[PDB]
Amino acid sequence: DLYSRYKKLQQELEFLEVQEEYIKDEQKNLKKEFLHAQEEVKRIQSIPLVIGQ
Amino acid sequence: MSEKKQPVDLGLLEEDDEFEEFPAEDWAGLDEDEDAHVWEDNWDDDNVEDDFSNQLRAELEKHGYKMETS
Amino acid sequence: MITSAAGIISLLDEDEPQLKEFALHKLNAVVNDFWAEISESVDKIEVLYEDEGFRSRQFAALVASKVFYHLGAFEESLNYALGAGDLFNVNDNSEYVETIIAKCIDHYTKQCVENADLPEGEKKPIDQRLEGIVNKMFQRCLDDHKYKQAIGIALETRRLDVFEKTILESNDVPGMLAYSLKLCMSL
Amino acid sequence: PPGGGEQEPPPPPAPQDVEMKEEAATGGGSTGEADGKTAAAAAEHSQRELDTVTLEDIKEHVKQLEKAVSGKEPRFVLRALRMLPSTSRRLNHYVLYKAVQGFFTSNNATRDFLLPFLEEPMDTEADLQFRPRTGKAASTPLLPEVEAYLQLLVVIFMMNSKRYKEAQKISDDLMQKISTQNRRALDLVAAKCYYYHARVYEFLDKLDVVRSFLHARLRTATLRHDADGQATLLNLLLRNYLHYSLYDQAEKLVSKSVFPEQANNNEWARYLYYTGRIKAIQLEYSEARRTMTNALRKAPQHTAVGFKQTVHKLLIVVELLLGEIPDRLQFRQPSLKRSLMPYFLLTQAVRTGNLAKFNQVLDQFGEKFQADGTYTLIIRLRHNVIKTGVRMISLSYSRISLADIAQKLQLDSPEDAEFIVAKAIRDGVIEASINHEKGYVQSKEMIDIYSTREPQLAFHQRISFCLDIHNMSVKAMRFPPKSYNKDL
């Protein structure tokens, strides 16, 4: 189990390594979706309107 | 670590063991007039003061005598 | 003994190598003290290493290999280390030997992995002395096997007949095979 | 006598409380932290350790305590000794053994019981489990206290401490590699110890063994190291090569490496001071100047008053060699002033450039800078006066008089004038146009900057470099917030 710990840990290494491109995709895409929704709720606001008090 | 400052401090103690409070007061003679004054401007001031310390310290009164001769 | 002495450089740049021999022998004593002094003699060492003029290739190969991982990458050191030809070295606790055999084993199993997916064709040449110096320490650790790393290194080397001699003498064979499969399924 | 006798007991055990609290908080805190995971936490308590060291360096603790206050020396940690489980009885013993000496009196000594400190490590340091880290955290803090006052025949005892330290750990090691935080601390700790007995080394004998084997001990560290400990061990070697080396053919440009990330807010300053001192011998105008000046502008943390004074002296000394010497302006302290007082007159006399008088003037009151030894940079400076002077001439007008300026420079002759001028031209540090018509030598001597002349190629490298610095500064405002958000 001592020498097996290495070979067993390699799987965890690859598993933790594969998450890099994943979080890259998330952080790059969700900000684009963020500005998307931002402009979506921004275009809701229009100049012509009624003035209250 | 900073432990290397000890022999330097001891060296300073030796420098203080050389003379006792002589340069302190001797330079305090100037520093008392130099006190409260910006030490940035004192560089050029001490520069010119030490430059003219040898000869032509004033020279402003000599100009009138140098009018006819030059 | 000597440290900043540049004399051994002039001796290494000098002909009639019979006087260069003991100079290099004494150089091997101070090489651990200062590896920076040999840096200027590295090129000449390489020069005398290339030609067959000198009788002992291992004497130059050892100095080159030990000064290379001190200076540059472990690769260039391993080249002359594995290209040292016939070499006799007893087991030692020194850093040099264990590190160079560490890189030797790592690069060996690296080449084994690289050649694992290529069963036939374009086979890379493998020297016999490499297999010898690897299997020497391998068997040395395979004496009692210590019931741990035997099947591990047997699997990591990606060799077909390597694990057949490992199961010759062992305790609790079904447990060893179970542990083996357990190790093989997790990789 | 009766007054001082009645007032005698309160002063000596002043630090005891806060010191016990200190070692309890640091030890119990660190151990109680990394106990669950040692390999996880890395160098969290390191800065605290070095801070406590730098704080305890100025300690006024032992003065009149030389008499029977040494009873704290025989006693020690004693945390959960001889058995791993059943620590309750020992939790009682923690109060008990402290209560024993608190009844009436206690038998104390100084030089009597010293050597047998290795009794416990022979079997169990503390818990038989955590022994290396608990052991170092036990022995190492109290050792400088016992080894304090290097003078008065403590040299032999210091040697005993040496061989004991080695034999227990330093000789080689307790195991192949610790590979943990206690190891990462062990680097700077053992290094600090090396700096501690360095004084004993350089005191009388020389080095035939230890630091020479420290190379093998350095490469024993793997190249996968952050090279922090490697650099700290490199500092003592470089300092050992500081006084006398004189061979630049190897370690210069061989010792250069990948140079990994290291800060510590100390090592940068002191190592830049070291390599600056080494590179000050060839008189580097470009790199050494700005990097040593920057190094002077760095390390605000502890003391710039008593430390940076030396590198400031060296700074102005290598500054006056260019003909333009800046003085002390922004920094106000009553140290560098007194240190520069004898040197002030001459460093101010540099710009004047009078050979004859100042030749005698220097040697007249000269003490310290000629006590630097072997008259090197000063025997260079003496004839550097005329080079800085002719450089001032290069900054001066073009037309050269055979009488006026020849008398002003105290040198009158047709040949050597134009000759030395040409020698100032071949340097490439200035700009001049050599022309001969009526026998007089003129110059264009344009000092005008790059403004409105090839601007792009001019400030190109400046823009690139500054943008690189600002971008790595963006990285510097990037990674640490992630280091903040890692645990939350």
Side-chain angles (χ1 to χ4, degrees):
Chain A
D1 293 329
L2 197 277
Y3 193 80
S4 175
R5 182 168 58 185
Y6 178 83
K7 193 174 295 181
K8 180 63 178 179
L9 187 61
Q10 291 296 323
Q11 183 178 1
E12 184 176 356
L13 261 57
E14 297 177 353
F15 186 81
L16 189 60
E17 190 274 337
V18 79
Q19 302 299 325
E20 290 293 331
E21 197 272 342
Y22 162 64
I23 195 63
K24 287 292 181 298
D25 292 336
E26 275 191 340
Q27 71 181 359
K28 72 180 297 182
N29 292 322
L30 267 74
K31 58 170 56 181
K32 294 192 293 291
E33 298 179 356
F34 176 75
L35 55 89
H36 260 291
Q38 179 63 33
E39 291 184 352
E40 279 176 354
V41 301
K42 181 61 178 63
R43 68 188 300 266
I44 297 299
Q45 298 178 354
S46 299
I47 304 95
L49 45 78
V50 56
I51 297 91
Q53 57 182 359
Chain B
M1 288 64 69
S2 299
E3 298 181 356
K4 299 180 182 180
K5 300 179 182 180
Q6 296 181 356
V8 183
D9 292 333
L10 291 178
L12 294 182
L13 291 179
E14 293 180 355
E15 294 180 0
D16 298 330
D17 284 329
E18 295 179 355
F19 289 154
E20 296 295 330
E21 300 295 328
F22 291 162
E25 296 179 354
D26 289 332
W27 287 91
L30 282 74
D31 286 332
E32 63 179 1
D33 295 330
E34 197 179 0
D35 191 15
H37 298 86
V38 182
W39 292 262
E40 187 273 337
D41 185 82
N42 288 319
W43 164 59
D44 287 326
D45 189 17
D46 202 348
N47 186 12
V48 177
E49 189 274 336
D50 194 18
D51 198 352
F52 292 162
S53 61
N54 189 14
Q55 291 297 118
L56 55 110
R57 181 182 62 87
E59 191 64 27
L60 265 65
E61 299 177 355
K62 192 178 179 180
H63 282 86
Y65 295 155
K66 291 177 63 179
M67 289 180 182
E68 63 277 8
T69 62
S70 298
Chain C
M1 182 61 65
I2 50 97
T3 58
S4 62
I8 56 180
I9 293 179
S10 298
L11 293 177
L12 194 143
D13 297 332
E14 192 65 27
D15 57 342
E16 53 179 359
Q18 65 270 15
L19 50 84
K20 188 193 305 299
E21 293 174 353
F22 71 94
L24 189 146
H25 180 270
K26 297 174 184 177
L27 187 147
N28 293 323
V30 299
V31 64
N32 54 9
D33 295 331
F34 291 90
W35 60 273
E37 198 271 348
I38 323 294
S39 61
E40 287 75 11
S41 298
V42 164
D43 54 344
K44 187 59 184 296
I45 289 173
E46 294 175 354
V47 168
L48 61 92
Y49 178 78
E50 290 294 331
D51 57 342
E52 60 181 359
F54 196 81
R55 61 181 182 180
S56 181
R57 57 186 181 272
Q58 59 275 11
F59 285 166
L62 257 57
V63 177
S65 65
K66 72 180 64 177
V67 78
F68 278 162
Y69 85 99
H70 284 175
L71 196 150
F74 298 93
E75 298 294 333
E76 188 179 2
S77 66
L78 188 61
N79 292 127
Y80 290 165
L82 298 177
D86 189 18
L87 178 61
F88 300 95
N89 189 13
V90 296
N91 189 16
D92 192 15
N93 295 324
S94 180
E95 177 267 345
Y96 169 74
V97 43
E98 64 184 1
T99 43
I100 62 104
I101 68 177
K103 271 71 179 179
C104 177
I105 290 174
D106 293 331
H107 292 83
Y108 176 77
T109 183
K110 177 63 179 298
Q111 294 296 328
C112 290
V113 170
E114 290 178 354
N115 296 324
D117 51 340
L118 277 71
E120 75 278 4
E122 60 268 5
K123 183 66 177 180
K124 296 182 180 180
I126 301 176
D127 198 348
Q128 301 299 325
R129 59 178 61 95
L130 274 64
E131 299 291 337
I133 63 176
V134 163
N135 292 324
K136 183 171 64 178
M137 285 63 175
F138 180 68
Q139 183 60 242
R140 181 179 56 85
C141 301
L142 247 65
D143 295 334
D144 197 17
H145 308 264
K146 204 183 297 180
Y147 56 84
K148 42 179 62 61
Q149 88 283 14
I151 194 63
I153 306 178
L155 260 296
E156 288 181 357
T157 186
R158 294 293 187 271
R159 238 269 296 275
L160 54 98
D161 60 336
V162 65
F163 51 87
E164 274 71 1
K165 58 184 180 64
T166 65
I167 48 95
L168 193 147
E169 43 176 0
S170 61
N171 298 324
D172 301 330
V173 180
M176 295 298 103
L177 268 64
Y179 178 80
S180 176
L181 192 143
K182 182 180 66 178
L183 177 59
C184 289
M185 65 180 297
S186 63
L187 65 90
Chain D
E6 290 178 353
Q7 295 181 1
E8 180 69 23
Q16 179 181 3
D17 298 330
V18 296
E19 285 295 331
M20 288 176 60
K21 181 62 179 179
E22 184 65 31
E23 62 181 2
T26 54
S30 300
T31 55
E33 192 274 336
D35 49 7
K37 296 296 295 181
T38 305
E44 288 79 9
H45 299 276
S46 61
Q47 62 277 7
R48 297 294 181 268
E49 286 179 354
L50 62 88
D51 283 332
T52 50
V53 170
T54 55
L55 188 145
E56 76 184 2
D57 192 18
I58 318 104
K59 279 297 294 181
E60 207 66 27
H61 170 70
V62 43
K63 42 177 72 62
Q64 200 180 1
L65 281 71
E66 294 293 329
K67 295 182 179 297
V69 198
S70 63
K72 275 69 178 298
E73 300 178 356
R75 72 176 183 89
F76 60 98
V77 183
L78 283 103
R79 289 282 292 189
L81 259 296
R82 194 75 280 274
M83 198 177 181
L84 179 60
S86 299
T87 60
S88 299
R89 299 179 180 90
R90 290 171 176 84
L91 283 173
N92 299 324
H93 281 86
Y94 296 153
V95 184
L96 286 178
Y97 91 97
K98 295 181 186 299
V100 170
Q101 298 181 357
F103 287 110
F104 289 154
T105 48
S106 297
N107 298 116
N108 303 325
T110 61
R111 300 180 183 270
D112 189 17
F113 184 80
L114 181 64
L115 305 178
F117 287 164
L118 300 182
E119 189 272 336
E120 295 293 335
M122 284 301 297
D123 188 19
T124 57
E125 276 74 1
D127 47 15
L128 185 54
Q129 181 180 2
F130 284 97
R131 299 163 60 184
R133 53 180 298 175
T134 57
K136 62 183 66 175
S139 299
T140 56
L142 48 81
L143 286 168
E145 295 183 354
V146 186
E147 298 301 329
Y149 292 161
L150 192 149
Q151 301 297 327
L152 285 76
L153 48 81
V154 194
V155 178
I156 303 176
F157 293 160
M158 187 59 198
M159 185 65 190
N160 295 118
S161 298
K162 288 177 185 179
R163 57 174 56 88
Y164 285 165
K165 285 171 182 62
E166 282 134 22
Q168 67 183 354
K169 17 92 237 59
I170 59 216
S171 278
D172 42 344
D173 203 342
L174 54 96
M175 67 173 63
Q176 45 279 358
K177 190 65 64 179
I178 324 290
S179 70
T180 44
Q181 186 181 4
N182 53 5
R183 148 181 151 271
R184 287 185 288 270
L186 183 61
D187 299 333
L188 52 89
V189 164
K192 182 181 64 63
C193 172
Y194 293 158
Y195 301 125
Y196 189 80
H197 57 63
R199 302 179 185 91
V200 182
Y201 284 168
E202 294 180 355
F203 192 79
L204 49 97
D205 283 331
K206 64 180 183 62
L207 162 76
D208 292 84
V209 45
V210 179
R211 307 174 183 179
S212 296
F213 181 77
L214 193 139
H215 301 279
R217 182 180 172 86
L218 192 68
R219 289 187 171 274
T220 197
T222 321
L223 281 73
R224 303 299 181 271
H225 269 262
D226 190 80
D228 187 18
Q230 178 176 0
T232 58
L233 293 180
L234 188 145
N235 292 127
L236 60 93
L237 296 176
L238 209 158
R239 192 191 66 85
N240 192 19
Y241 297 157
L242 191 144
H243 48 272
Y244 295 94
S245 290
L246 290 84
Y247 62 103
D248 297 335
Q249 65 270 11
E251 64 270 27
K252 306 299 294 182
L253 297 177
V254 166
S255 62
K256 270 66 180 180
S257 298
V258 195
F259 292 159
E261 299 179 356
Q262 305 170 358
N264 197 17
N265 317 133
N266 190 10
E267 201 169 16
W268 267 108
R270 56 179 55 195
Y271 174 79
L272 218 165
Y273 164 71
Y274 294 158
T275 186
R277 177 63 179 89
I278 302 300
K279 288 186 296 182
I281 197 169
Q282 70 270 18
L283 284 71
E284 181 66 27
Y285 296 157
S286 180
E287 192 271 342
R289 171 65 169 84
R290 58 176 180 87
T291 193
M292 186 171 61
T293 311
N294 190 14
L296 178 140
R297 295 193 183 99
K298 290 302 186 295
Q301 290 81 17
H302 191 270
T303 48
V305 187
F307 188 88
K308 298 300 180 299
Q309 55 182 2
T310 306
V311 72
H312 182 74
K313 180 179 177 62
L314 182 65
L315 180 61
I316 53 100
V317 157
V318 304
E319 271 173 353
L320 51 84
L321 302 177
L322 287 79
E324 299 295 330
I325 169 65
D327 291 332
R328 184 191 61 85
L329 268 65
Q330 59 182 357
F331 293 159
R332 179 185 61 87
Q333 51 269 0
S335 295
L336 283 72
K337 295 177 61 62
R338 295 184 180 92
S339 300
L340 197 134
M341 278 178 184
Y343 207 85
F344 182 78
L345 181 61
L346 63 95
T347 195
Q348 191 62 259
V350 169
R351 294 177 177 177
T352 54
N354 191 10
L355 296 174
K357 299 296 183 180
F358 295 152
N359 190 13
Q360 185 60 251
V361 168
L362 288 173
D363 193 19
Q364 181 64 33
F365 68 95
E367 194 274 333
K368 185 177 179 62
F369 60 93
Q370 76 176 2
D372 192 16
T374 66
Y375 54 83
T376 54
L377 200 44
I378 183 176
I379 209 65
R380 297 188 188 95
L381 178 57
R382 287 182 63 257
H383 289 189
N384 193 13
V385 172
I386 194 62
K387 188 167 68 62
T388 58
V390 77
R391 184 171 298 177
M392 185 61 191
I393 301 302
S394 70
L395 298 177
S396 179
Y397 299 88
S398 178
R399 304 297 181 91
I400 168 173
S401 179
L402 194 142
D404 297 331
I405 197 172
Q407 183 181 0
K408 187 177 68 62
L409 295 177
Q410 292 85 24
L411 180 139
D412 42 6
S413 179
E415 293 80 4
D416 55 13
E418 190 273 338
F419 199 79
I420 294 176
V421 162
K423 293 299 173 295
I425 295 175
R426 63 173 291 272
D427 297 331
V429 297
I430 47 95
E431 178 175 352
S433 174
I434 300 95
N435 291 315
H436 296 85
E437 180 68 25
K438 62 184 67 61
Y440 292 160
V441 180
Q442 292 76 12
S443 64
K444 54 183 178 296
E445 64 178 5
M446 183 180 294
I447 326 182
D448 181 79
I449 55 183
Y450 57 90
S451 294
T452 68
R453 184 61 179 176
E454 299 294 332
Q456 302 81 14
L457 191 142
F459 43 64
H460 179 271
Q461 55 181 356
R462 171 61 184 176
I463 294 177
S464 66
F465 291 160
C466 79
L467 272 175
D468 288 329
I469 300 300
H470 294 105
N471 208 335
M472 73 181 295
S473 300
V474 169
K475 298 295 183 180
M477 72 174 290
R478 273 178 182 179
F479 185 80
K482 269 67 178 178
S483 298
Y484 156 73
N485 208 350
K486 58 173 287 181
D487 58 341
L488 50 88

PDB file of all heavy atoms in Angstrom, chain D residues 404-420:
ATOM      1  N   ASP D 404      43.810  79.724 -19.886  1.00  0.00           N
ATOM      2  CA  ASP D 404      42.770  79.829 -18.862  1.00  0.00           C
ATOM      3  C   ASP D 404      42.362  78.488 -18.251  1.00  0.00           C
ATOM      4  O   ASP D 404      42.638  78.221 -17.080  1.00  0.00           O
ATOM      5  CB  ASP D 404      41.535  80.518 -19.444  1.00  0.00           C
ATOM      6  CG  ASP D 404      41.812  81.946 -19.874  1.00  0.00           C
ATOM      7  OD1 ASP D 404      42.696  82.589 -19.269  1.00  0.00           O
ATOM      8  OD2 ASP D 404      41.147  82.424 -20.816  1.00  0.00           O
ATOM      9  N   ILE D 405      41.703  77.648 -19.045  1.00  0.00           N
ATOM     10  CA  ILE D 405      41.192  76.374 -18.549  1.00  0.00           C
ATOM     11  C   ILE D 405      42.336  75.412 -18.226  1.00  0.00           C
ATOM     12  O   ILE D 405      42.175  74.485 -17.431  1.00  0.00           O
ATOM     13  CB  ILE D 405      40.222  75.719 -19.565  1.00  0.00           C
ATOM     14  CG1 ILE D 405      39.385  74.627 -18.892  1.00  0.00           C
ATOM     15  CG2 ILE D 405      40.973  75.170 -20.765  1.00  0.00           C
ATOM     16  CD1 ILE D 405      38.291  74.069 -19.775  1.00  0.00           C
ATOM     17  N   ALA D 406      43.493  75.647 -18.836  1.00  0.00           N
ATOM     18  CA  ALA D 406      44.681  74.852 -18.552  1.00  0.00           C
ATOM     19  C   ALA D 406      45.179  75.143 -17.143  1.00  0.00           C
ATOM     20  O   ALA D 406      45.678  74.256 -16.451  1.00  0.00           O
ATOM     21  CB  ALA D 406      45.769  75.132 -19.575  1.00  0.00           C
ATOM     22  N   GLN D 407      45.040  76.398 -16.726  1.00  0.00           N
ATOM     23  CA  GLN D 407      45.408  76.809 -15.378  1.00  0.00           C
ATOM     24  C   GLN D 407      44.324  76.402 -14.386  1.00  0.00           C
ATOM     25  O   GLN D 407      44.612  76.085 -13.231  1.00  0.00           O
ATOM     26  CB  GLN D 407      45.643  78.320 -15.323  1.00  0.00           C
ATOM     27  CG  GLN D 407      46.109  78.832 -13.970  1.00  0.00           C
ATOM     28  CD  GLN D 407      46.301  80.335 -13.950  1.00  0.00           C
ATOM     29  OE1 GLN D 407      46.088  81.013 -14.955  1.00  0.00           O
ATOM     30  NE2 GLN D 407      46.704  80.865 -12.801  1.00  0.00           N
ATOM     31  N   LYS D 408      43.077  76.411 -14.847  1.00  0.00           N
ATOM     32  CA  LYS D 408      41.948  76.016 -14.012  1.00  0.00           C
ATOM     33  C   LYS D 408      42.015  74.529 -13.677  1.00  0.00           C
ATOM     34  O   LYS D 408      41.669  74.116 -12.571  1.00  0.00           O
ATOM     35  CB  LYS D 408      40.624  76.343 -14.706  1.00  0.00           C
ATOM     36  CG  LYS D 408      39.398  76.130 -13.831  1.00  0.00           C
ATOM     37  CD  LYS D 408      38.124  76.541 -14.551  1.00  0.00           C
ATOM     38  CE  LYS D 408      37.826  75.616 -15.719  1.00  0.00           C
ATOM     39  NZ  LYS D 408      37.597  74.214 -15.273  1.00  0.00           N
ATOM     40  N   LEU D 409      42.466  73.731 -14.639  1.00  0.00           N
ATOM     41  CA  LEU D 409      42.625  72.296 -14.432  1.00  0.00           C
ATOM     42  C   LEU D 409      44.020  71.976 -13.902  1.00  0.00           C
ATOM     43  O   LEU D 409      44.362  70.811 -13.693  1.00  0.00           O
ATOM     44  CB  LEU D 409      42.363  71.532 -15.731  1.00  0.00           C
ATOM     45  CG  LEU D 409      40.941  71.605 -16.291  1.00  0.00           C
ATOM     46  CD1 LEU D 409      40.847  70.865 -17.616  1.00  0.00           C
ATOM     47  CD2 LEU D 409      39.941  71.048 -15.289  1.00  0.00           C
ATOM     48  N   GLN D 410      44.816  73.025 -13.703  1.00  0.00           N
ATOM     49  CA  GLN D 410      46.180  72.917 -13.183  1.00  0.00           C
ATOM     50  C   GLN D 410      47.075  72.042 -14.061  1.00  0.00           C
ATOM     51  O   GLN D 410      48.064  71.483 -13.588  1.00  0.00           O
ATOM     52  CB  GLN D 410      46.173  72.379 -11.747  1.00  0.00           C
ATOM     53  CG  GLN D 410      45.581  73.335 -10.721  1.00  0.00           C
ATOM     54  CD  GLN D 410      44.071  73.234 -10.619  1.00  0.00           C
ATOM     55  OE1 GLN D 410      43.482  72.203 -10.946  1.00  0.00           O
ATOM     56  NE2 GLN D 410      43.436  74.307 -10.163  1.00  0.00           N
ATOM     57  N   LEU D 411      46.722  71.927 -15.337  1.00  0.00           N
ATOM     58  CA  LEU D 411      47.534  71.187 -16.294  1.00  0.00           C
ATOM     59  C   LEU D 411      47.685  71.985 -17.585  1.00  0.00           C
ATOM     60  O   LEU D 411      46.705  72.237 -18.284  1.00  0.00           O
ATOM     61  CB  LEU D 411      46.914  69.815 -16.574  1.00  0.00           C
ATOM     62  CG  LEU D 411      47.634  68.884 -17.551  1.00  0.00           C
ATOM     63  CD1 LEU D 411      47.616  67.456 -17.029  1.00  0.00           C
ATOM     64  CD2 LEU D 411      46.991  68.949 -18.928  1.00  0.00           C
ATOM     65  N   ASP D 412      48.916  72.375 -17.903  1.00  0.00           N
ATOM     66  CA  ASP D 412      49.168  73.172 -19.100  1.00  0.00           C
ATOM     67  C   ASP D 412      50.139  72.497 -20.067  1.00  0.00           C
ATOM     68  O   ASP D 412      51.333  72.381 -19.785  1.00  0.00           O
ATOM     69  CB  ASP D 412      49.697  74.554 -18.710  1.00  0.00           C
ATOM     70  CG  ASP D 412      50.719  74.495 -17.589  1.00  0.00           C
ATOM     71  OD1 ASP D 412      51.105  73.377 -17.188  1.00  0.00           O
ATOM     72  OD2 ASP D 412      51.135  75.570 -17.107  1.00  0.00           O
ATOM     73  N   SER D 413      49.610  72.084 -21.217  1.00  0.00           N
ATOM     74  CA  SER D 413      50.389  71.473 -22.295  1.00  0.00           C
ATOM     75  C   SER D 413      49.473  71.153 -23.473  1.00  0.00           C
ATOM     76  O   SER D 413      48.352  70.683 -23.281  1.00  0.00           O
ATOM     77  CB  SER D 413      51.097  70.200 -21.821  1.00  0.00           C
ATOM     78  OG  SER D 413      51.825  69.597 -22.875  1.00  0.00           O
ATOM     79  N   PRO D 414      49.947  71.417 -24.699  1.00  0.00           N
ATOM     80  CA  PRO D 414      49.168  71.177 -25.920  1.00  0.00           C
ATOM     81  C   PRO D 414      48.807  69.708 -26.141  1.00  0.00           C
ATOM     82  O   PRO D 414      47.664  69.402 -26.479  1.00  0.00           O
ATOM     83  CB  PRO D 414      50.101  71.671 -27.033  1.00  0.00           C
ATOM     84  CG  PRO D 414      51.028  72.625 -26.360  1.00  0.00           C
ATOM     85  CD  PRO D 414      51.237  72.065 -24.989  1.00  0.00           C
ATOM     86  N   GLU D 415      49.775  68.816 -25.951  1.00  0.00           N
ATOM     87  CA  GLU D 415      49.596  67.405 -26.286  1.00  0.00           C
ATOM     88  C   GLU D 415      48.651  66.666 -25.341  1.00  0.00           C
ATOM     89  O   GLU D 415      47.669  66.061 -25.780  1.00  0.00           O
ATOM     90  CB  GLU D 415      50.953  66.693 -26.302  1.00  0.00           C
ATOM     91  CG  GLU D 415      51.895  67.147 -27.409  1.00  0.00           C
ATOM     92  CD  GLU D 415      52.611  68.444 -27.084  1.00  0.00           C
ATOM     93  OE1 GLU D 415      52.439  68.956 -25.958  1.00  0.00           O
ATOM     94  OE2 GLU D 415      53.348  68.952 -27.957  1.00  0.00           O
ATOM     95  N   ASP D 416      48.942  66.726 -24.044  1.00  0.00           N
ATOM     96  CA  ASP D 416      48.210  65.930 -23.063  1.00  0.00           C
ATOM     97  C   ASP D 416      46.763  66.388 -22.911  1.00  0.00           C
ATOM     98  O   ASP D 416      45.902  65.609 -22.514  1.00  0.00           O
ATOM     99  CB  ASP D 416      48.922  65.965 -21.706  1.00  0.00           C
ATOM    100  CG  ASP D 416      49.155  67.375 -21.198  1.00  0.00           C
ATOM    101  OD1 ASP D 416      48.565  68.324 -21.752  1.00  0.00           O
ATOM    102  OD2 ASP D 416      49.936  67.534 -20.236  1.00  0.00           O
ATOM    103  N   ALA D 417      46.507  67.656 -23.213  1.00  0.00           N
ATOM    104  CA  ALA D 417      45.147  68.183 -23.207  1.00  0.00           C
ATOM    105  C   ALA D 417      44.265  67.400 -24.173  1.00  0.00           C
ATOM    106  O   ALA D 417      43.347  66.689 -23.759  1.00  0.00           O
ATOM    107  CB  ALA D 417      45.147  69.661 -23.561  1.00  0.00           C
ATOM    108  N   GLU D 418      44.566  67.527 -25.462  1.00  0.00           N
ATOM    109  CA  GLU D 418      43.815  66.847 -26.510  1.00  0.00           C
ATOM    110  C   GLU D 418      43.900  65.330 -26.364  1.00  0.00           C
ATOM    111  O   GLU D 418      42.976  64.611 -26.744  1.00  0.00           O
ATOM    112  CB  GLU D 418      44.322  67.281 -27.890  1.00  0.00           C
ATOM    113  CG  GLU D 418      43.469  66.816 -29.065  1.00  0.00           C
ATOM    114  CD  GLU D 418      43.855  65.439 -29.570  1.00  0.00           C
ATOM    115  OE1 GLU D 418      45.002  65.013 -29.319  1.00  0.00           O
ATOM    116  OE2 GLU D 418      43.013  64.783 -30.217  1.00  0.00           O
ATOM    117  N   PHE D 419      45.009  64.848 -25.810  1.00  0.00           N
ATOM    118  CA  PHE D 419      45.199  63.415 -25.611  1.00  0.00           C
ATOM    119  C   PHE D 419      44.201  62.863 -24.592  1.00  0.00           C
ATOM    120  O   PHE D 419      43.463  61.917 -24.878  1.00  0.00           O
ATOM    121  CB  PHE D 419      46.631  63.125 -25.159  1.00  0.00           C
ATOM    122  CG  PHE D 419      47.057  61.701 -25.364  1.00  0.00           C
ATOM    123  CD1 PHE D 419      47.444  61.254 -26.617  1.00  0.00           C
ATOM    124  CD2 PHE D 419      47.077  60.809 -24.306  1.00  0.00           C
ATOM    125  CE1 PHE D 419      47.838  59.945 -26.812  1.00  0.00           C
ATOM    126  CE2 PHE D 419      47.472  59.499 -24.494  1.00  0.00           C
ATOM    127  CZ  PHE D 419      47.853  59.066 -25.748  1.00  0.00           C
ATOM    128  N   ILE D 420      44.178  63.468 -23.408  1.00  0.00           N
ATOM    129  CA  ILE D 420      43.263  63.063 -22.345  1.00  0.00           C
ATOM    130  C   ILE D 420      41.812  63.299 -22.760  1.00  0.00           C
ATOM    131  O   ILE D 420      40.931  62.502 -22.437  1.00  0.00           O
ATOM    132  CB  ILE D 420      43.562  63.811 -21.026  1.00  0.00           C
ATOM    133  CG1 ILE D 420      44.937  63.412 -20.489  1.00  0.00           C
ATOM    134  CG2 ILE D 420      42.500  63.519 -19.978  1.00  0.00           C
ATOM    135  CD1 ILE D 420      45.353  64.171 -19.247  1.00  0.00           C
TER     136      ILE D 420
END
